């Protein structure tokens, strides 16, 4: 599966390691939120990450379906 990732600093799409067929987004607020917006975390996983208090989580299976908010899922 090809998936957006926040590892690189110009966010790119990468083929994911074997066994990890899932994409995910995570979004929440820092103490920098009012001046930088919400934190964004992108990558792959074997199972979807558990949700904690006050954060969004998205999952999917097609390619590039976890885009940056300022981006589109092309």
């Amino acid at each position, epitope marked *: 599966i090809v998936c957006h990732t*926040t*590892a*690189t*600093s110009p*966010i790119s799409a990468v083929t994911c390691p074997p066994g990890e067929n899932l994409c995910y987004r995570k979004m929440w607020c*820092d*103490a*920098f939120c009012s001046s*930088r*917006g*919400k*934190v*964004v*975390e*992108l990558g792959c996983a074997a199972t979807c990450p558990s949700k904690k208090p006050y954060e969004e989580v998205t999952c999917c299976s097609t390619d590039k379906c976890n885009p*940056h*908010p*300022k981006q589109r899922p092309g």
Partner: antibody
Amino acid sequence: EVQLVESGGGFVQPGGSLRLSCAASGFTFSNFDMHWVRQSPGKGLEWVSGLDHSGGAHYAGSVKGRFTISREDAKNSLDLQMNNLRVDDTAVYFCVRGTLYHYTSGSYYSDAFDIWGQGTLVTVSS
Amino acid sequence: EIVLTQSPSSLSASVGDRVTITCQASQDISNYLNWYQQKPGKAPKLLIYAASSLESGVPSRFSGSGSGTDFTLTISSQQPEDFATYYCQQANSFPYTFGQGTKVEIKR
């Protein structure tokens, strides 16, 4: 797992030379701002040098003109050449990665120091 | 250069105590302050950034308050794992600077 390993520390006479090398596992350090922070009793934790995510070198005042930092691609390592060493440079030297956080506004570097190496000792004495 | 001074330098506490360390800067740094934990013979570990945000994996009993020149690190329920030396670090101006450090010792 992500980790930092540093080497080259030792024990030299004032005016001598040393070279510290730092390698990473789990990430490419040229993606991040790398730093060197030294620790000794009498001066505490002190920022020393830095090689940012663009290849630029940075140095603290008390060490500029004597230290040099560079990517050595053929070694997959971060090197710190320490020349004209003096006694107060005796400390434990840490190789450190700066945090790279993504927001809806962009990427922000070195807000903090998230990954620290184990530390290598540098002794300068008569 | 911005100067950081922690208070106190040493403090005793029992398991279950509420521990409070303060950190003061030579001028305003907004909330660009980090907190690190260090055990002897070991590298420091990042605990707080942005003066208040916990780094992933850190237990929620840690909390950080403060903006401007006065900052606070608080352990609500002291555990044995939490006996170490704590450092604050500012990331507002260059160069980065740390406090002298504060050791949390076991009361008996």
